[PDB]
Nucleic acid binder design. Structure first.
Length: 99
DNA sequence: CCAAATAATAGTTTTTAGTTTATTGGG
């Protein structure tokens, strides 16, 4: 499903029926596995941007309800060390729910 | 490739020695 949603808009410009359920299931599994949710969100943005919203109208009533998820809850001294801690690096990025 | 404990150099404000001036008396 990650691959399917990863398809460009050009190919998916026909048979939105194929891609809808996979998108919904991706958004469902996002509550557990974030990266699939992120990439599916990216694909959904792309489709919204590059496809006429009229053809998505029949199932905006479907996509949005499954997005109810993810919205449910809510050394270092003043001494001048040149702050080699800061000078070290920035740590590699991971993904999070908040973003 | 950071990992801590230890003397040096130089941030003061001190005197002193090259300074520069208005009165000197020469066609």
């Amino acid at each position: 499903l990650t691959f399917l949603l990863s398809l460009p808009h050009n190919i998916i410009e026909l048979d939105v029926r194929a891609y809808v359920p996979a998108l919904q299931m991706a958004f469902k599994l996002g509550l557990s596995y974030t990266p699939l949710a992120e990439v599916g969100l990216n694909a959904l943005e792309e489709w919204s941007i590059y496809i006429d919203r009229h053809v998505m109208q029949p199932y905006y009533k479907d996509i949005l309800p499954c997005l109810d998820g993810y919205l449910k809850t809510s050394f270092n001294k003043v001494v001048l060390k040149h702050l080699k801690k800061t000078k070290n690096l920035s740590s590699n990025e991971a993904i999070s729910l908040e973003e």
